[PDB]
Design a protein around this nucleic acid. Structure first.
Lengths: 53, 74
RNA sequence: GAGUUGAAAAUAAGCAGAGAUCCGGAGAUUCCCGAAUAGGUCAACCUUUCGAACUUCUGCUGAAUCCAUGGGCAGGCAAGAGACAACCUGGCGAACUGAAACAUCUUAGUAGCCAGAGGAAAAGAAAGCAAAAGCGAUUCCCGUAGUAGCGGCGAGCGAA
RNA sequence: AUCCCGUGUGAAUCAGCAAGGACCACCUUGCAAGGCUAAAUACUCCUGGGUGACCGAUAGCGAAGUAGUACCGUGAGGGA
RNA sequence: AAGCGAGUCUUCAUAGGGCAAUUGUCACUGCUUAUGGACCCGAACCUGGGUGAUCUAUCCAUGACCAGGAUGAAGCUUGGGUGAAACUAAGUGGAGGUCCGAACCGACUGAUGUUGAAGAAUCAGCGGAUGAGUUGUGGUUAGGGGUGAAAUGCCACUCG
RNA sequence: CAGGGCCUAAGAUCAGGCCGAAAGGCGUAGUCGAUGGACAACAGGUGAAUAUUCCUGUACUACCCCUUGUUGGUCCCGAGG
RNA sequence: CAGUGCCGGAAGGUCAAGGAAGUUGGUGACCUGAUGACAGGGGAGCCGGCGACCGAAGCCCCGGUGAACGGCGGCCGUAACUAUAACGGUCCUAAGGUAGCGAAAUUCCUUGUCGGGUAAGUUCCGACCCGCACGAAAGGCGUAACGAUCUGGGCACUGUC
RNA sequence: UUACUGUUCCCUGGGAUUGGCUUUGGGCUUUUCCUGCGCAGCUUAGGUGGAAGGCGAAGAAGGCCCCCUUCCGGGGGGGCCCGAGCCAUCAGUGAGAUACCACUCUGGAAGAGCUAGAAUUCUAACCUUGUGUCAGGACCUACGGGCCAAGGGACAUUCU
């Protein structure tokens, strides 16, 4: 019926699958909620933090 | 109660209609489900009873402005 | 300004033309129960370390946890609790009835129940009506009008 | 159609958005997703005045004396 | 219905036909009609919120009672019988959803009593009476229910 | 002497805690709750109405004072009962 | 083991919500006709209608299961006198009642017929089976003991008479 | 009650809570091909356009051979060999070259995207448990709270 969107993440730690600490490979919102955001492992791409830093 | 503390979503008094237009009551209520969401101002999980629209707020807007919008965080 | 100690007579003693009784404004006391509140309670009682218990506020100390939170201690004329006929608002919310039966509908979002609150409450300052002409928040009354409609196009319901 | 909600998806800022009874085009009107406000208004457990083609002890309040009393019920309650 | 208008609709047609070509109003009183309890009395009922498990139907907790008298199951120990068994006299014992029968519990028959002494009893007998017993006190389940060794029984002389 | 100043059973109320339109429902600590557990008085007389209660005899509980010792004691905790 | 119930099964058929290729409609900048008082076509955007195909369980289907629901038949004929049917054929079902019982708490006719009991017995007991309309866990047939159970008879006993 | 209309328990699908890896694998594409018996014919007429030039020796006609749809009539190249041609208007012919290609078809592949479904597991969501550990004046081997551990696990749970 419907598909849920994909949320952007910017890394802070080496993914054992795809990304080494700095890539912008966007995966899933639930993979950010349950796994990446509590473990200090990814962040949300915001223009206030990415563009000026 | 079946209310979400962040967004004030309550149950819906909404009848159900059959083919012969017979109407019962069917109190219709939200999917405010048990979760345990990470909190950045303490770096720790909080156990909450969240509606899914409020889930979309605390992932979209962040838990700080939503929890201060409700007024409670502890 | 002339007699008083209620109804309510009698008796015993008073109180009073340096003004009693009484009336009015502001105060004081208000045992015990009852929100009842130190704790219990089988209401008007018991036990008491004689205590506004609990929630809220303020202050100190500050667990698992670093900041926290919880707790504990303390202060406080100390904010709330409880009551209220009807109206008002919010929520749950019928059925007998009418349809000459009855299920859509009506009775009816009425009664009842709970919560809240004031002398009124709700609403209320146009993301509005209207129609090429115009009005300027909400509420209430007369009217349009029993009209346009809605409805097993039945019973009925009925605006703007 | 307008208005408000349940699940899920999910915009635009004035060069726009919403409404004008499906909807589209043009015009007109207004600026939702933030709150607060007196008056006119409805009622009587009452209070203070004035009335009554209202009653007069089977009436008028249930109640003109102990009246929600005596009495009945375990109680809710009924009730002179 | 746009629309036309002393006309208009139907039509190829005014040929014909339908309907018009005009008419007071506001009150009071009276009779009827419509919505309300609607001429008065009367249901069995339905729904909502409460009150009740002192009666009674379960169950729980904690206590108490069951006079007196009969029978003698299991076991045990002696002694018979073989190298041990199987089994039996004889005592001892006191089991029972045992028997007779009081308190107690219950109500099978009959008579009385039917404005009864009594809204369910008296009298004469009757069934159980160590149990699936009886009872006191404090409780428990509450009506779209409870409880029921199950009768639609009982839930305060009320229960489809 | 019988209850309370002691204790708990069934059960109730339940701080916090979970749940739920409201009212409230579930439930832990805790607190109530005797029909139970613990605790010390009997005989004679008096008497219009009172007697284990008043009088007299003998007792028994629970604390204080008076004399010997001790420096720790009370409560919570561990156990028997 | 037919129908129903229950269990199991997956091949196929039927199949909702929803997704979706495609098709189609309305509006519409613009282009054309137009002795009419207007009309025809139409890009994008927006709003829709139908919709090939996917789409589970259920259901149809298949197989099992009577201490699951329940049901267990008619028609005639023929054996050395009268008979009666061991036996036979036929129709229809899923199958046509097995043991035992049997005028029964079940039997209408019926007070069936016989035997017992009685002077006399629509009641009782023992039999036959023509069981209107018994029957095997809605169990069937029995029996010691028991019953304020129903019912038949007898002794003793008496105002029941 | 297999009367009607329904409701509820329950089951089953789309969404959400809801994530990570790889396979089996049905439909769309990311370029190229083997590929086509109306006709008289060097030939089994793939509907159109570019058309005097391409494949070539970085080794072509024709002989050695593996494979296939098959109307076994006729073809493709992997290896070796061979040694200077396959032609091009030809006449047939609505429409022409097996000299060449941008496209693309009834059938499939090469490595890749997208979407199913189903399966494998991991833990981090979610569920359950712990007389395992810590905690305040003291306990929580009393519910519970923090931590840790184990079992499941994107299933189950809850909602529409």
């Amino acid at each position: 019926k419907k598909v849920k969107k994909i949320r952007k993440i910017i890394l802070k730690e080496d993914i054992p699958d795809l990304g080494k600490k700095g890539q912008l490979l966007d995966v899933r919102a639930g993979f950010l909620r349950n796994f990446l955001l509590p473990l200090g492992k990814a962040e949300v791409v915001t223009p206030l933090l990415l563009k000026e830093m | 109660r079946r209310i979400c503390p962040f967004t004030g979503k309550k149950s819906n008094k909404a009848n159900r209609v059959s083919h012969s237009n017979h109407k019962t009551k069917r109190l219709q209520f939200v999917n405010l489900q048990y979760k345990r969401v990470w909190w950045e101002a303490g770096k720790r999980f909080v156990k909450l009873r969240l509606s899914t629209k409020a889930l979309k707020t605390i992932e979209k807007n962040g838990l700080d402005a939503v929890a201060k919008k409700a007024g409670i965080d502890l």
